[PDB]
Amino acid sequence: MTEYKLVVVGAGGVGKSALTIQLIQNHFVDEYDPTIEDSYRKQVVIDGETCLLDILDTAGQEEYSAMRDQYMRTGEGFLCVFAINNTKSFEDIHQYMEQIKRVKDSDDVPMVLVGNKCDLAARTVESRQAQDLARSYGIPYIETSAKTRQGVEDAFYTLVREIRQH
Ligand SMILES: Nc1nc2c(ncn2[C@@H]2O[C@H](COP(=O)(O)OP(=O)(O)NP(=O)(O)O)[C@@H](O)[C@H]2O)c(=O)[nH]1
Ligand SMILES: [Ca+2]
Ligand SMILES: [Mg+2]
Ligand SMILES: [Mg+2]
């Protein structure tokens, strides 16, 4: 069966681990334990196809930025997460996407831009601002809540479907 190497990237605290754990383990992690680098694998059916999702949950803390080159080298698709209540994380995710492009020396890296924490009402990134950023990359924008599960499957499965357009 096809294996898909997904990598979840973004600034600290935007909910990378919460999104991944919700997808793989179907529960919401309320506490905040900063990640170094964790890996998850799960067999799922997507569009009638049995596949293996290999998911790398990466560090948002800048203290571990040295590890980025290795995982950007090997990742096949990138879930580029920011939190809609964190304008700085939106500015940061643009930097992540440029770094991925640079490390991979490619203009066509499979990516999905994800605006997480859409259950919160303290929004400072409007959907249209994120839509514009995605459009300049030619990639989808999807809003999610790891807390309510809204959009979580859509976001990860869209990224699978992006890898398959390539
Ligand atoms: N309300 C709400 N809180 C969320 C959501 N996603 C994550 N959180 C909360 O935000 C905090 C950080 O989540 P976490 O997944 O650890 O973020 P992270 O991006 O993995 N952090 P790091 O980069 O340091 O590993 C946690 O308290 C978590 O419960 C969401 O969609 N909604
Ligand atoms: Ca803890
Ligand atoms: Mg984490
Ligand atoms: Mg504004």
> Tokens 């929004």 — which residue?
123
| Spatial CA neighbour of 144 closest among 18, 53, 9 | 18
CB of 145 closer than 8 Å to CB of 83: no
Closest residue by CA, ligand 1 atom 24: 34
SS3 84: coil
φ, ψ at 25 (rounded to 5°): -115, 0
Beta strands 49-57; 2-10: pairing state = parallel
Q: How far is CA 16 from each of CA 3, 75, 87, 117, 164, rounded to the nearest angstrom?
A: 21, 16, 16, 11, 23
What is the distance between the alpha carbons of residues 97 and 66, in angstroms, rounded to a whole number? 16
> Tokens 């995982």 — which residue?
71
Mutate to test the pocket of ligand 1, among 9, 117, 153 (most ligand atoms within 8 A of CB): 117
CB of 19 closer than 8 Å to CB of 144: yes
58 C-beta closer than 6 A to ligand 1: no
Q: How far is ligand 2, taken at its centre, from the CA of residue 147, in Å?
A: 17
Which stretches within 34-151 are classed as H helix?
68-74, 87-104, 127-137
Token representation of residue 161: 């479907």
The angle at the Cα of 2, spanning 26 to 137, to the nearest 5 degrees, equals 75
Q: State the DSSP string of 7-49.
A: EEEESTTSSHHHHHHHHHHSS---S----S-EEEEEEEEETTE
| Spatial CA neighbour of 149 closest among 118, 111, 110 | 118
Q: Give the number of the ligand closest to the Cα of residue 126.
A: 4
> Which string of b and e fits 77-116 if b means at least 16 CB within 10 Å?
bbbbbbbbbbeebbebbeebbeebbebeeeeebbbbbbbb
Token representation of residue 50: 């049995």
DSSP state of 61: S
Element (H, E) at 158: helix 152-164
- The domain defined by 2-165 carries CATH number 3.40.50.300: yes
15 C-beta closer than 6 A to ligand 1: yes
* 33 annotated as ligand-binding: yes
Resolution in A: 2.0
Q: Which ligand 1 atom sits nearest the alpha carbon of residue 28?
A: 29
60 C-beta closer than 6 A to ligand 1: yes
